[PDB]
Amino acid sequence: IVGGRRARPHAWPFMVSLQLRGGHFCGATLIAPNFVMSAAHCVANVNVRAVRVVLGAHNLSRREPTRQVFAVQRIFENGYDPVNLLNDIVILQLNGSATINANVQVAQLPAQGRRLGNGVQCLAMGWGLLGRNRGIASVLQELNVTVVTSLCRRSNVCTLVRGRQAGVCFGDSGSPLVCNGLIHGIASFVRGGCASGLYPDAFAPVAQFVNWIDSIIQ
Amino acid sequence: RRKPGKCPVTYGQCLMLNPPNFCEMDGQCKRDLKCCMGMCGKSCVSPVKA
Numbered sequence: 001i002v003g004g005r006r007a008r009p010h011a012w013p014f015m016v017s018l019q020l021r022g023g024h025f026c027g028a029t030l031i032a033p034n035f036v037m038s039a040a041h042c043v044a045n046v047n048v049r050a051v052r053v054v055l056g057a058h059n060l061s062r063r064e065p066t067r068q069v070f071a072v073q074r075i076f077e078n079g080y081d082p083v084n085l086l087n088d089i090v091i092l093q094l095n096g097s098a099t100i101n102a103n104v105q106v107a108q109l110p111a112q113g114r115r116l117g118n119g120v121q122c123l124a125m126g127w128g129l130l131g132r133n134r135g136i137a138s139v140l141q142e143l144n145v146t147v148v149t150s151l152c153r154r155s156n157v158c159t160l161v162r163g164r165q166a167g168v169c170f171g172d173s174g175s176p177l178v179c180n181g182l183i184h185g186i187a188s189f190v191r192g193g194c195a196s197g198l199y200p201d202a203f204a205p206v207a208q209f210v211n212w213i214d215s216i217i218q
Numbered sequence: 219r220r221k222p223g224k225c226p227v228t229y230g231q232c233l234m235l236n237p238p239n240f241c242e243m244d245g246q247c248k249r250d251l252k253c254c255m256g257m258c259g260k261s262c263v264s265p266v267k268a
């Protein structure tokens with residue numbers, strides 16, 4: 001996240017870090033005690049058997065007792081197109097069920113087909129680059145963003161920070177976009193580099209997949 | 219070595235630090251294919267005009 005701020009510890013208890021060899025490579029969202037959702041492109045070309053799903057994290061550079069760690073048991077995808085990053089969403093069933101507590105909680109999803117209009121205020125977050133480069137974030141970052149429809153595909157939800165250069169950045173793939181307490185986006189791609197001030201950041205539109213998500217998790 | 223032709227244009231870039239690549243140079247691709255960055259990592263693709 002470029003141009004955002006530190007989250008308060010465990011402010012977003014559904015926020016997940018996907019890790020390989022003990023290193024964060026993508027965000028994810030806890031959507032049931034035993035399921036997370038992320039961007040399909042995150043796992044498309046990694047060994048799914050090697051992925052560690054880290055719940056209850058805040059500072060990736062510290063040992064944290066609040067963490068719960070799982071492996072991926074099963075994978076579900078619904079028409080992911082890697083050329084165009086369409087349907088860039090994956091559900092990963094965990095090899096166990098999280099203990100629900102202060103620091104690990106399940107996210108709430110919008111209704112099927114809900115589309116957000118221009119100007120809706122959302123919150124993006126993640127452990128991606130801070131930009132400068134200030135390098136990667138140790139502490140989870142968050143950023144106020146505005147939904148935009150211009151320079152966005154109908155198959156995405158896009159956001160743009162008003163009047164300054166800020167936005168999601170590399171390492172934020174798969175992270176949730178929260179709008180009015182609901183997960184409406186999964187970070188997918190940028191254009192013109194991070195925080196271009198021109199191109200909206202693009203998210204997989206979670207609301208378009210809710211019936212499919214429920215068909216798996218319910 | 220690099221081959222004739224150009225890589226196709228792409229719409230945007232996935233938000234991974236290091237998108238996995240399946241090639242690093244054109245010579246690793248068959249026939250006239252080039253090693254090109256897609257939206258998320260490099261792959262062997264047919265060339266477009268230069």
Ligand SMILES: *[C@@H]1O[C@H](CO[C@@H]2O[C@@H](C)[C@@H](O)[C@@H](O)[C@@H]2O)[C@@H](O)[C@H](O)[C@H]1NC(C)=O
Pocket residue numbers: 049050051052069070071072095096
């Ligand atoms: C769930 O998986 C946990 C992590 O397993 C470890 O990481 C994975 C990616 C593999 O490398 C595996 O060989 C490692 O052991 C386990 O610690 C945990 O016991 C598993 N829970 C079960 C079996 O319900």
Ligand SMILES: *[C@@H]1O[C@H](CO[C@@H]2O[C@@H](C)[C@@H](O)[C@@H](O)[C@@H]2O)[C@@H](O)[C@H](O)[C@H]1NC(C)=O
Pocket residue numbers: 121122123144178179180181182
């Ligand atoms: C920045 O955003 C803060 C949090 O936004 C609200 O909560 C998040 C989790 C989403 O549900 C989002 O849609 C909500 O708007 C606000 O509390 C704060 O007012 C915002 N700051 C400014 C300058 O307006």
